[model samples]
Structures are given as structure tokens and as C-alpha cells.
Target: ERPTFYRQELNKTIWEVPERYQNLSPVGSGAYGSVCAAFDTKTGLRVAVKKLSRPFQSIIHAKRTYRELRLLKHMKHENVIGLLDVFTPARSLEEFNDVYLVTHLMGADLNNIVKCQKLTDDHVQFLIYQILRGLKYIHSADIIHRDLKPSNLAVNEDCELKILDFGLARHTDDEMTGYVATRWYRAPEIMLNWMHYNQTVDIWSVGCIMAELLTGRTLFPGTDHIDQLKLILRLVGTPGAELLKKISSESARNYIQSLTQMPKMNFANVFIGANPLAVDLLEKMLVLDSDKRITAAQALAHAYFAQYHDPDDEPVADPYDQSFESRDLLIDEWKSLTYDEVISFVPPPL
Candidate 1:
């Protein structure tokens, strides 16, 4: 049998991957990992190869690596990033340290595209439609993507969008964390601990992305945690007494009550020249109460996406397996588990 992997150098770092993946070039790097664009000889397409950064350095890091890989493997939707291959440089369980993930390489992420290009209303509508489409698939699997921002959204010139990154994703039943999303895209309920949050957090993020696409600027440009809440309320206005009662933080509730109640800002003024349908959708999505926010499926049905919304085409995923997430494993155990996941894709004994 042939060797399972071949060694190549990408940006001065050695990468051991299947021989089919070649012509590697650095694409980007972040705290989680570094990525390279490579040619897939067998598939005849360019792919993004991500090298997990110190995956086993800590239990939390290892768990996140595992979670991201598993979720990417589980999800299969045109609007969601595809995992084409996975590999590890390590030859044995003991030697395993680095893991690599290969996925579809897009032209650029939404963040860059939004900044560099002047998108028309048609582009905004289609882009937001795809975002909700992908989120629908994720939520259908009972997974909360926790992190949903423009940078995590991949896009092509034609407005084809795919949602990527799942390191912070958790099952709907999982413990609701205080902060998981990027500060700008974070939901008000998550920041203030208003109540147990669910998939509505992703809805809030979609609203922020829509506003940014229309205006080419961040909707909530807060400097700190406190300021983040203030900025969000400034746009949506203060929640009423019924909604305020849900706040778990005494300080948060008291702070809101002490302030002069701010009325909801008119969307026409904020998103000048924006489509009324787009503004209506944003109003439905950016609600202060998580329970009141529009869902991905509901967003798909809205007038904003009337041109492309097809119930038959909007698919949902089977619920994901949550058992692996509950396990506490040592570095060695994590290495072995991740190694197994990588090689499982390899075809054997031709």
C-alpha cells in the first residue's frame, strides 16, 4: 500500500498531506490556525488547507479542534463550507501533534468583499439569503454556531456565500456561555445574560451583517463589554419591563432601568436608501429579546428573499451527535481520536 501522506513545505512550515494536494501557498493565519491554498490534483480544484495551531496545547484547545472538525464533517450544504479532506503529519498516536483540514477555497471572505466592493441591493439580498440558508442547516442539527461574523462567511464574486468556522459551536441544550461570538456580532442576550439563549444569537448576527452590507460599516462598534450593550440598545432601543425581567444580571437590569428609555430608531434613517423589505427583515432580526428574534427558516420566507426563497431547496440537517463533546480526554487521547478522524478518509488496499 502507498504511504497515507506526503510531506510538503508551506510558508516555511512542513505539511504532511495526501499527495493529491499540491502547489501550496499561504492564504491567511489567525489565533486558531494558519491556512494555505493548494491545488487538488485529483479533484482539479484549489482547496484551502488549514493547519490547526497547537491543537493539543490545552484541553480547551484540543476540544475546540475536535469540535470544529466534527461539525465540518457532519454538515453538508451548498451555503456551508465543505470539508474535502483531513490529515495529520504524525505517523503514530504518540507522534501526532498537528492536524490539517482541507476545504473549498473561495475568492474571499465576506468581510473583505464588503469593504472593497460596492454591493447593490440584489447582492445584499442574495448574500443574506445564503447566510440564513446555511444557518438553517446548522440549527436543524441542533447546533448553535456561537460565532457568526462576516469574516467567518466565505463568498465568491457571484454572491455565492458559505458559512465557515465552528470551533465555538455548541448543541442547543449545551450550557449557554457568556461570550462566544465576536463582540460586534454578539447577541444582546449573550452579553447581558438576559436568559438562556438559543439559535436566535445567529439571527442577531445575520442582522448585523445585513446592516454592514447596506452601509459598509459595523453596526455596533463598541469599545468594551459595557459599551457593546449600550451600542446595541442605542439602535434597537431599551426593552420593556416584560423583557427586562429576563435579565440574569442585576446590574444589567438596574442599569437599563436607570437610563432614560430610548425609543427604537427608524431603520429608514439608519439604513438610508436601503430596501424597505431589507429594513423590515433587520427589524425582525435585531430584537432585544432572543425569543422574539426571527429564525433562519423564518428569515428565508421573508419578502427580502422572495426572489430566491424556495422551501423545497432550503434543506435541514439531521441532528448532530453530541456524545463526543461531553468527554474529557488527555492530550494523548485527543491525539488518537483526531488521528483516527484524519485517516478515516483514506481509501485502503486498492
Candidate 2:
């Protein structure tokens, strides 16, 4: 029988576990890996452990993961997710290669909390400011978070927002590749199959997020790429013939040919009487032509935030505090995993 050994290269160890923490529980799972709640044995510190699955297709993915680590190392903002340490699984011929990244576990993802409840004006403003702040940091570094949605926005115990999941993220300056983000949050250019795009793609996702926060639902929930286009047309009006002609792909251009009329949905009505400032901002962000969409820095200057931002205050508290038992306990085994080893663990379905 094969030994039940854990692979080291894919599993990443983020920090040195102190020694007291012996009990940990499962918290979440995703395409690349799974996260667990663990206790620090020595200082009783509670932390979230993210174990990564192994690489399947290209080494580029492995490189992307490391790139994210490098990016996080330089960022120290309140709204971005905080990284604690990385872990590598013990290596052996028979074991699964695994890598683990340790980070402060967030209180709850925005999607998990927004159900059945409408966001207050203050809440919407707070979320937008924090998200933009984090995006500002990312854009400055030339990184584009391809996936930006409610689930990726984690709220700590203090209700502070942090962006997570850098697996699909890429550097905008690179001209070598193109990646498709989740359909609903994707920009018109991306949905139109444009190979080259910029930070504006992220801005579109932020706009979708903002609308969802106000309405307690998805802004553009489409079944496929075509459906997604219809959803966008419904919200922002259809692109003009010259605009459609600009798409590089014949199929995408053909797709645009099928549409007959511009969608006439009113932004104000969609949010059920949303604040005009919020609606105004949404309209700019959801512009059909990517060039016309607002930039992250510009979004920060929107009147919506100005109407609700408290310039004199600080962030409330650490959001991950609730996932751990104390601050001193250490789990040495959890701290020994590496990045390569973690990627080996990602399920095939992801």
C-alpha cells in the first residue's frame, strides 16, 4: 500500500507555528486549494492555513502564484489581505506535492453576508473606498486582479474589506497571454474577446460589485458569453457599429451583429431607488467602451465616496481574529508546507 505522505513542493508554509495549537478545522475550499482554521500552540495565536494543490497545465500558473506572494510582501494597506507566512510540504516520491500560504482568516466574505439584507449608504461607500484603495495598490504595481467579486472580498472581524484569490491575477504590462475572468464581473472588452486590456477590466468588476452591494444581487448574471453580452447591453446600452467593428475576433463581431436594439434599463430603477451619487458612479464604471470606463484612481474620487468617507478615522480591528482560539499556539506541521506541494492538491473539477 502507498504511504499516506504529504507532498512538500506544492504545500507552502507561511510562518513558524509556535507549538501549542493542536486542533484546526476546515474553513473554505477553491479551485487551487483549501483553507483551515488552526491554533498557535505557543502564543495561542489563531491563524488560517491555505494549502495549495499542484500544477497541472503550465508552469506559468506556478509563476503567477509566486508573483502574488511577491506583490503581497510589498503591500501594507488596511484593505488588502495580509499574508503571514508560506509553507512547503515534506518531499518524497510517493507523497502529493503541496504548498500552503498562511494568511489572517477573514470574518466572512461579502457574498455570504449580503443575502436578504440591503446595504446602507455608509456600507456601500465603505466597501467601494476600501476596494478601490486595494485596487490602487495593485494597479500601481501593474498587477490586475482578473477575478474580483463578492466572494473574493473578505471582511475581517472588524468589518474591514480585503481582496483575496490572486491565482487568476496577471501583470497588465505583459503582452504574452490573455486570461478570462469570471463572466459577470468581466469587462466588455474581455467579453468581446479582446487580447489586450488594462486595469479598466478590474474597474468594471468593481462597478458590478458596487451595484450588487446596493441591490443584494448580481448585476449581470449571464449563462454564457453571449448571455453575458446581453446582460451588459441591458444595463449599459449596446455598443455602436463602429465600436463593434473594433473587436479583433470575427466571432465576437458576428455576435454583436445579432443584437438589434440598445438595452434601455434605468440604473436608478435597478437598485430600487439607489442614491444618485451611487448610480452616477455605476454608470461611469459600466460604460460599454472600456476606454470610457472610470479608472480605479478616478473611482476613488467619485462623489459617492466623498459623501460617505470619514477622513479622520482609522480601520476598526483585525478581521481574522475570530477564526483562531488565541495568539500564541503553534502548529509546526502546518508551517512546513511549500508552494509546489500545494498545487498538487487542487481537485480536477476546479
Candidate 3:
């Protein structure tokens, strides 16, 4: 069946929307595609529907769509974005040109909130806690969300935060860095292109986010990739000689040696009246060495998060019905699973 297409302008492009989601309005655009705010006439739920423009144009695009659809369907975590529904306007798979994903409609993204609002410690802690809580579940799923930045975090005024945008997420041991996280929020290990890394990279990004929330400013607003390294180094100082040897990339190691060494900034000065514990946690999270970085579980266990830690505050388990071990995902596999996931909806066993 063909979806009834309704045209609307978004980000200087015409968005072809489905008729089921009424009152549609453009939300924004990015690397993936344009998202619109809409209300589902069938479900009576207000949702954000992303129009993935030309998803099949590249092999990478198709695979990301596959992973995103697969993970969203099998997963059930409060801190992770819920995939409400998926659809395509094309009547047949061969004729498919775009894909649309419906997800939770958030009040605002963390990036906008962090930039405009003068956040307090309570806000920072609560937000950071939720991010770690989300990361805990995501990491346990054997999936590494390669991108964990403020914009990727969605939130409501009630202190609710959920992780979104799984397009870059991959199972561990599959392209460890997974196409380099956004530089400002990227872990040093990834920035330097260290081959052997782990899920700790996401934790580094959280630390970066926490710092921004605390300061109400971006932690590392680097002008470029190299400047991004310089920004982190300025605050973190030189990596230990032992850790420096671990960097596999020659250019990165040489660049590190070329720069003047720095003294680690004082958290008390950096955080500026931040909860000592909050500052302490921030310092722990932004470590240059991925191995030395704290895991999301360790982060939740820390004294800063102790107040929120309850016996009932447990992470959700991996609900993935199937797993893909290969990073080199084929386009056809992406197209097949992508369509099947939406069309073969089981409706969660009513």
C-alpha cells in the first residue's frame, strides 16, 4: 500500500509526510534527515517522525537504518528513545526512496537547554544521572552508542532524559570508534584514532556533557579536529608517558609530543562552585586513556550519584531478539530487515 504523501517545507527542503500523523510541523534537520512534530491519528500519541532522505543512496546509510530499526524494536528502556512506528511511502521495496521513523516527542534537546538555561547542580546531577542510566542500559545491550552528545540527548522540564539517534551505534568489536563521534564530545582515544578502544568512549562523552551542564557552556568547542585535541589537552594536560605509548597512530603521537605540556586544570576552578562530588566525577570521566575511563556502571556507583542509587535503580537488560556480529553490513540486508521490521509489526502481543 502506498502512504498518502503530504508535502511540507522543512529546512529549505520539501518534506513528504504521511497523512496518519496530523498537524505536522518541521522540527529540524541534520546528518540523518529532517524530523517533524506530529500527532498520530491512529494511536492518539504526539510523536516526532524523521524522514530519512535518500537512505539507500549509500551503503552506510542503509546499514544505519537497519541497526536503528532493529535496536529500537527489540529494546525497552525508559532512558532510551522508543521507536513508536516506521513507514515508507513507496509501494514496493525496489521503489523505496525514503524511510520515516516515529519516536517520542521531546520538549527540547539537551543541547538547546544547556546553551540557554542557567542550570543548577540539581539539574546537572539529575541530567547526568539519567544519561549514565541510559548508557548503562545501552552498553549492557552489547551496543556501543558511538555518538553521545548533548544534542543526542532529549529531555523534558521534569528532569526526564532519554538517549536518541542510534544511527552510529554498533555492537562492540565492530569498528570500535564507529566513524568518529562528533569532535567536541569525542573521547580522546577516538580523537587520536586509537584502534583498540572500548565502550568507555561513551563515558568520556558523558563527562564532556556533564561539564557543559555544570558550566552552562560547551566543554570543548574546538574549531576543528586538531583544535579539538588541543582543547582537551589544555584542560587535561599531557597523557602519561606509559599511556602515550599506547596510541597506535603515529601522527597523533607525534602531534602530542610537538605541543607544550599542560598542567591539569583544578576542578574547583573549572567547575566553579560545583558540588565537590560533581567536580570529582567530572574529572574522572574525561580521562584521556580509554582504559582508565570509568564505565557507566562505575559512574552510577560513584558517591556523586549515591543519593539517586536505590536497590530498585537497576538497569534494563538487553532485549535484542537477534544480534549482528558483522560491521560490514550489506545494503540488501539493510533494505530487507529495514522493511520487514516495519511491515511485520507484531504489535507487542495484545
The number of the candidate with the highest lDDT is 1
- Cα lDDT tens digits, model 3, 1-350, are 55687777756777676788788888788767888899988788888988886777778778777766777786677888867877776777777667888887887789768767788777787888888888888888777887788778888878798998763644344333333335678777776576577889889888888888877777887766677778888888887788889988887778788988888888789778888998888888888877888888888889987767754775666655545636667788678778877787543321
Selected candidate, larger TM-score, 2 vs 3: 3
Error of 2 at 253 (Å): 1.5
Ranking by TM-score: 1, 3, 2
Question: What residue pairs clash in candidate 3, if any at all?
Answer: none
Instruction: Looking at model 3, report the run of 10 residues with the lowest lDDT sum.
Output: 171-180
**What tens digits encode model 2's per-residue C-alpha lDDT throughout 1-350?**
12232222222433223233345567766666667787744444577877665432344444545445454554456677756655444445245344556666666898866784566878788888889878876776666777787878998655588888763544243322232235677777875565477778899999988888888778777766667677778777777876676677888777677878776578788767788988889888888777778887777777788864453532322221112212222222222222333334321110
Which pairs clash (backbone N, Cα, C closer than 3 Å) in model 1? none
Candidate 2 runs further than 4 Å off: 1-21, 29-31, 41-45, 55-61, 89-98, 167-182, 263-265, 307-350
lDDT of 1 by residue, 48-93 (tens): 9888888889877777777777777787888987688777766677
Clashes of each: 0, 77, 0
- Which of 1 and 3 is the better model by TM-score? 1
TM-score of each: 0.88, 0.73, 0.84
Give lDDT: candidate 1, residue 211: 92
TM value for model 3 = 0.84
lDDT of 1: 0.81
